[PDB]
């Protein structure tokens, strides 16, 4: 939670999100639903796939990792082989566990940053047309049909044609 979006100012997740990660909930007049944000979730899934596959493939493959056996007169050799195997295992355990933990944290704040960047993206597209509330939600001042969603998720939300309507709704009396 470095960027403080997930578990920050977006208190809880959504159980109905099944198609994508960083979706929406457009409680507009024409209907509702949990349409995902295809660009952001596709890029995020791509990124995590690169991360995991890099973790797998970079590990080189060799045909043996087996400690050999020794009789009762090569206790030096047996102890040395045990030291090599145990040191390799210790280094691998430390490195692998610190990795797993560290890029677990990187994955968490990367999802945090994706939700963040999405939030500031929508906020910049809307500027002051739609007021902000808690939980990362929004409140469009103007009348808002489904074409809003088309423009919002394609990034082509043209501010000026809805500007004056919001200006009227700022006070409304």
């Amino acid at each position, epitope marked *: 939670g470095l960027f403080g979006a997930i578990a920050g100012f977006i208190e809880g997740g959504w159980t109905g999100m*099944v*198609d994508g990660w960083y979706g929406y909930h457009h409680q507009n007049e024409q209907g509702s639903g949990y349409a*995902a944000d*295809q*660009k952001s979730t*596709q890029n995020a*899934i*791509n990124g*995590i*796939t*690169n991360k*995991v*596959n890099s973790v*797998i*493939e970079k590990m080189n493959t060799q045909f043996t990792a087996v400690g050999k056996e020794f009789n009762k007169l090569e206790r030096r050799m047996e102890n040395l082989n045990k030291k090599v195997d145990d040191g390799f295992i210790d280094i691998w355990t430390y490195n692998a566990e610190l990795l797993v933990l560290l890029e677990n944290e990187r994955t968490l704040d990367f999802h945090d940053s994706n939700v963040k960047n999405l939030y500031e993206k929508v906020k910049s597209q809307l500027k002051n047309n739609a007021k902000e509330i808690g939980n990362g939600c929004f409140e469009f001042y103007h009348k808002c049909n489904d074409e809003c969603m*088309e423009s919002v998720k*394609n990034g082509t939300y043209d501010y000026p044609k809805y500007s004056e309507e919001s200006k009227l709704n700022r006070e409304k009396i």
Partner: antibody
Amino acid sequence: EVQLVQSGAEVKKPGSSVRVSCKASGGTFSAISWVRQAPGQGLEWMGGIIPVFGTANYAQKFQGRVTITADDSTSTAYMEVSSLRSDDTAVYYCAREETWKGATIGVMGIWGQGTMVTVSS
Amino acid sequence: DIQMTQSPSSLSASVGDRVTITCRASQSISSYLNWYQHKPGKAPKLLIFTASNLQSGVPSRFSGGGSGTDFTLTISSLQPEDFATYYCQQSYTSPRTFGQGTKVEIK
């Protein structure tokens, strides 16, 4: 460049199950896609899973009849279709979802080679 | 859910010509298109992914383009080793629908 080695060629009676493998060369977590090449018809994507979500998505005209499972342990995708019928005679192609710009999702990247699955008498 | 209507259905040409394959989509799929050539009796393989990028190990004569509901694939010139049917895929939303197939044959 993951050398996908799909299963061999097999035939079965109508109204049964099929098992077509997509055994890869190296451990990979990119998505899996399966496509039907019926003779004379074009490609159409049937089903597929994303090892990130873990959910198994399917075509809206195929769900239930077809299931896809790919254990992350071996990264080998399995192909099951229940209640086989004659017009499903085709050759099956498996995609590993990996282009030059890393593992990207929404593309096909490298492809399989083909498994002849003909349903007849 | 979204149908990929290939256009034109099928034409013929010769070595070193100008051909355009248009993929039409009902709903806007942004720029998550593909372009697969399918040799008869061979594994299919893509040319352009995300409607602009070029796959590695592919001649530069293929140049995709377009976004939204109108797309394109502009071949610079035709050689005798790239005559086949062509498909366009959408991946903006599931399900993933392929195309009809535009064949090119010796004039």
